[PDB]
């Protein structure tokens, strides 16, 4: 009756937070560690490329299926243009955030200590040049993903349950 | 009515419940069941003439449960059969 699952964060009772099956779990931890955002040793440009590709690809559907021109003969083009415009606005947001947050001299802000106390090189994403590269990659990848989704949906037929 | 099936079912249910009460086959006033259903011994300040510890409270409780089970069985059998 003494077995318990919930534990204080990394064994420290006095740091705000708990360590639960949702937070720490081999499947959840592996999935979160293998996402491009937490691949701290990979160049920020390629991580941004993957993230932009995924987001631009997912954005196409909502703008095409629902919209002012959803019942017209140019629904796909209008939705794709709207998704590309949203990608452009988010790229502008990323650029201004990076300008406001990081300067050219600050080493890095990401934690350099693992949970097991190991010392590792801090992520280069939390830097001016790193954020700039990530933003450029995100812009290019988002445009590529929007274009790919448009091509698959309308340039080629590719029947889909809802389309 | 005395030999009827309903009378037999009722008398059998009541008799079996009383039998399981007097002998340690069911919980009673002087024999408490734990979380594991173990029937540990319990001391109550009730005096009875039955040498096994079966009291009037146990008689009433077992008779009530027997009447309940018998009525349920009789009605179920009448509805199905």
């Amino acid at each position: 009756e003494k077995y318990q699952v919930i534990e204080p964060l990394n064994g420290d009772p006095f740091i705000g937070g708990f360590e639960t099956p949702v937070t720490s779990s081999p499947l959840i931890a592996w999935y979160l560690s293998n996402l491009p955002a937490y691949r701290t040793a990979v160049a920020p440009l390629l991580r941004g490329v993957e993230i932009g590709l995924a987001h631009g690809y997912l954005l196409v559907g909502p703008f095409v299926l629902t919209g002012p021109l959803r019942n017209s003969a140019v629904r796909g083009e209008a939705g794709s243009l709207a998704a590309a415009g949203l990608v452009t606005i988010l790229t502008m947001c990323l650029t201004i955030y990076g300008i406001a947050s990081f300067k050219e001299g600050e080493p890095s802000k990401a934690p350099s200590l693992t949970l097991t106390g190991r010392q590792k090189d801090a992520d280069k994403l939390q830097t001016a040049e790193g954020w700039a590269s990530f933003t450029g990659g995100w812009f290019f990848g988002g445009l590529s993903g929007v274009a790919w989704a448009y091509i698959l949906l309308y340039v080629l037929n590719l029947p889909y349950p809802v389309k | 009515y005395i030999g009827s099936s309903t009378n037999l079912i009722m008398v059998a249910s009541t008799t079996l419940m009383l039998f399981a009460g007097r002998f340690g086959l069911a919980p009673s006033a002087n024999r408490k069941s734990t979380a594991g259903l173990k029937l540990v011994d319990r001391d109550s300040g009730l005096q009875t003439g039955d040498p096994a510890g079966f009291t009037a409270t146990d008689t009433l409780a077992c008779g009530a449960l027997g009447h309940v089970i018998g009525v349920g069985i009789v009605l179920g059998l009448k509805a199905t059969a």
């Binding site: 699952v5 360590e19 779990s25 | 734990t34 979380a35 594991g36």
Partner: protein, 89 residues
């Protein structure tokens, strides 16, 4: 945090399946028979998924009852083990 927080038994699955299939299969044309039949009676399944069943179908009620019973049995079985050995009674 223990890696095997959900202390792995993996035999509770079979016990739960058996202890849910035994009661459900008992009644006449009742229980897992309906779920199995509707699993078979997909429809024009010659290629892919025939359009989902309408609101006015018994499939929904039967599937809900079957999976609810299965989940209840599985949870009570998991608590039965791992709770008998930790104490609790």
């Amino acid at each position: 945090f223990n890696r095997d927080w959900l202390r792995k038994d993996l035999s509770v699955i079979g016990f739960g399946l058996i202890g849910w299939l035994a009661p459900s299969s008992l009644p006449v044309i009742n229980g897992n028979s309906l779920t199995g039949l509707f699993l078979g009676s997909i429809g024009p399944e010659l290629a892919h998924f025939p359009t989902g069943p309408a609101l006015t179908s018994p499939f929904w009620l039967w599937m809900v009852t079957w999976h609810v019973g299965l989940f209840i049995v599985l949870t009570l079985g998991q608590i039965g083990f791992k709770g008998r050995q930790d104490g609790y009674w």
